Subunit: 413 residues, 3 copies
């Protein structure tokens, strides 16, 4: 038959959404065999940079003093300032609670000591199994930076990630800081010249090719400022034009662009010091139109870029938009973004990614987003149901699978 | 009786909204006596450019191959790709279903062949009577382009539109492509000079005057790019200043501006290749302030222009804003736009227009929009009812008539 | 006794919100002992500039004729045009009704004459007691302009405001119209030179210092245009850099910036002729980063500046954002703004201010805003209750006190 009641439909959508294994196509997590770079712990959750920014709006403790404290002390301060002295109603604070509850811990007691004991008696491998199970995440895409001495080592040592973890080649240093990076390249055997000649071009391409072969990335990525433009006679513009795009096309690897971040407007805050700005769509429009054989994954930081980004996706099939990034990762914005996207793109987009920096975040990141996405799906199905259309649970499971996993794998080939 | 609760209010409002005859002040429909230019058919509905854009995001069929197929083949592909392989949850797909259901056809069967048979046994005149009846549309405003050889002929042959259809003089070729258009003008007896002198000015005005007399348009219209500015030393700026405005004032005809469309960012897609951009409000502000004796109808394409456009309407009574155009014609946006408009303008605006290109679209266009507009009205009436205001059903019927028909006719005199 | 259900939660929050005494940190009201500048009356409510703009969209009465009528005649016209000829559904009209109902008058009768009689038999001091009581407002922050001959007099006469009223030093003439203002300064004994030298700098600082000592303002304020930038080699840029900031720091007085207003786009409308524009965040960002020892209160006029303003607050603890100003003071916007703010800032912001120009407006301004703020809180508390957190009624009361009063006083010291 078909679904005949609004209740069955809802039960059906929520169940399908909750049961669908998720492919988180963009995170800052690492296969557990990569070592300490994989962050997890209630102390890591509480010291997430989102919460550092928030605690600094309340506490009288200087930023210097904060950075001087131990992670445990920072966590204690954040807990006291954001959870005890004021209700933890922000999205980031709410998330910490969702993680605790999901792990079987009880937020009702506010017993941070007891919460810590839970983690003290587990290994990274165990927690990963636990979390991926609780968050129903089957595949995690990492952010792998070959310019980070730490991460760099494991890749050179031939270490391969857990089969549940996939690599993504981060190129920010190369594209945004070529002047300083070119020195490290030549130091690694990549003889780039001071002038952008065929020699420099071939060496940069070799660097990319070497790492593509080494990581077997699902895509190459870069985060860009509000002022991003293309074409552009700059190191970034030339590298993208002469090296990145050609290589990406040859290996049929998508180019992921996270646009709109204004770095370090408040240096002292570190990762919590980045701001946002609306970008022009001209550069993305040009890339999509002039490079029809290249695939692009895009997410933008400014609320004001979201609707036009959806419209751009209507224009180019070689564009796949994804997630509600950072400052967009808040219920009010996730909801409006997801509705605009489905209304203009049907199911041809990737609703969300976690951008998790701490393992446990996969729990709240996906739990918070799934309930909103389910609500949107229920309304959209109810609307065509009202129009006389019949939908089957199989069709819903199909649609949900496309949104949470298939659209991505299908796009990166 | 007494409307003394949100519940009674909801019933009375929905009834009033549903029963109110609609004047669709902007469409791409034509009086049936104008011939084949009047599109209608389930195949026409499925090949609407909104769906072409959407199918191209999914199908592997090349755009060239798509355009090579017959309309029936295109419709079959779109149906399979957007309705069968994925649930038809997008607004445009949902609309097709609403039309079918409204005509008495059953979407539950997904029998495209049976749907086609319905249309095969009807004439244009009959379908028009059927659709206008089902969509409860009493008056349709057309988009009449004197630069289109096809349409041009019927007007020259003295053919007059059905009394339910009204004309609107489209001037895009003249204002946006004067360099190429000036040649057609002189070829039609309008001796415009290479230089913008009094001779050219008088000839352009004569062209406008001749067509105003020929069509008896309710308003003159033009769609403009995000970069639109005024004053401006350009063909567009000079024609508007020296010809359009003076003539519009003399005949007391409103000037309609549809701002924000960036034409052909993806040429191969044809009508489905247009993009959007936020525009500056400076030009509109200047026109409203410096030409107090001219009337302006405005709608904008960018989500980011909507709130400030509402504020501009608060500033100038010679400005009438209307509808949720194109990329704004989606539930999430229609809702936010309609609420911002009513909150700052009360009932002094035109909530919607269909922009229908295919006859049957009047059904879903108005059905989808009316349910949203009705909900906004219920909230607003309830808020004053709870404040102690007594709203009568007659007052609701009056307000609803203003929003859906009278405000337009009152503005265009 | 834990909060067992959302329904019970809804009640505790609404009670706390309704019972919490409000500090309205930005209004255009005056202590009753300041004289006629304190506007109150149903006629004043109806002739509020928000309604002037709205009536002009409907009435055929010329703007000249309108200004020529007496306040009573204007009120009669506005009442007839916006309440009788069309339902009073706009936010501003709804507000008038809420005020009447709150005062015990009955909107159901639409008896404007009877409403007027209520006010005719009361004094300013009495109405102030009545209104502050009904709106549950314990503290009102005024807008005091030393450049207004009228207001200026009472301050020079040593008149001190009622203890419920606080002063805020308005500096628009000085910062935005220095060229014309410098003449008044020297005329008052402040010997500023034509050139911006140390002499001019010291004299401007003396002017500020003299008025700070005279008003004992909670903060110094200025409203700025969409084009506002800083640093800037202009009178405004230099005065802010060399005089305002240093003085503000020395006295630890916050600098309030209301950004985005485009003055007089429609001169004839007077106060109702101001428009809006999106501003760059660069100037505010620079001020916050380069002047860590200065405190800034910011509110912006453009809908499109709201989200990034929230993000900027996440970056700088010396920034306190407040209210939904003017064109933002509409339910649809207040809701989205308040949700974005709480999601990214928890309770570290000031949700609203009335900007009341007419005494009675405190009633609707706060009643309309409180219901929305209460709904947002109910949702946010429900989300953490759902995550296992045990919110207590006393904690809700504390959070509510912070949002409506304590955050402000805590920020201004
Ligand atoms: Zn919204
Ligand atoms: Zn990331
Ligand atoms: Zn159109
Ligand atoms: Zn104000």
């Amino acid at each position: 038959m078909s679904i005949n009641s609004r209740e069955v439909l809802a039960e059906k959508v929520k169940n399908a959404v909750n049961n669908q294994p998720v492919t988180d196509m963009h995170t800052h997590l690492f296969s557990p065999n990569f070592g300490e770079i994989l962050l997890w712990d209630i102390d890591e959750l509480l010291t997430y940079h989102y919460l550092v920014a928030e605690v600094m709006r309340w506490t009288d403790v200087s930023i210097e003093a904060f950075w001087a404290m131990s992670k445990r002390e920072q966590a204690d301060l954040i807990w006291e300032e954001l959870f005890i002295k004021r209700s933890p109603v922000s999205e980031a604070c709410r998330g910490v609670l969702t993680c605790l509850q999901g792990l079987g811990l009880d937020p009702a007691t506010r017993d941070l000591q007891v919460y810590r004991e839970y983690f003290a008696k587990k290994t990274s491998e165990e927690q990963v199994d636990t979390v991926l199970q609780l968050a129903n995440v089957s595949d995690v895409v990492m952010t792998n930076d070959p310019f980070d001495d730490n991460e760099r080592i494991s890749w050179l040592e031939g270490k391969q990630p857990d089969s549940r973890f996939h690599a993504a080649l981060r190129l920010d240093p190369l594209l945004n800081e070529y002047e300083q990076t070119k020195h490290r390249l030549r130091d690694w055997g990549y003889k780039v010249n001071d002038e952008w000649n065929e020699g420099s071009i071939q060496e940069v391409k070799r660097f990319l090719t070497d790492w593509i072969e080494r990581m077997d990335p699902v895509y190459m990525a870069v985060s860009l400022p509000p002022t991003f433009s293309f074409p552009e006679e700059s190191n970034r513009g030339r590298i993208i034009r002469d090296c990145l795009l050609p290589v990406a096309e040859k290996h049929n690897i998508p180019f992921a662009m996270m646009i709109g971040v204004k770095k370090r407007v408040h240096p002292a805050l570190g990762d919590a010091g980045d701001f946002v700005g609306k970008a022009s769509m001209d550069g993305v429009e040009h890339l999509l139109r002039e490079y029809p054989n290249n695939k692009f994954l895009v997410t933008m930081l400014s609320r004001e870029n979201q609707h036009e980004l959806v419209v751009l996706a209507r224009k180019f099939s070689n564009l796949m938009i994804f997630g509600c990034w950072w400052f967009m990762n808040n219920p009010e914005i996730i909801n409006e973004m997801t509705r605009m996207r489905m209304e203009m793109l049907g199911t041809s987009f990737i609703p969300q990614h976690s951008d998790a920096r701490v393992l446990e975040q996969l729990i709240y990141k996906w739990h918070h987003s799934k309930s909103i996405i389910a609500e949107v799906l229920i309304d959209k199905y109810d609307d065509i149901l009202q129009a006389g259309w019949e939908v089957t649970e199989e069709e819903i499971k199909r649609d949900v699978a496309d949104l949470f996993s298939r659209n991505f794998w299908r796009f990166v080939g």
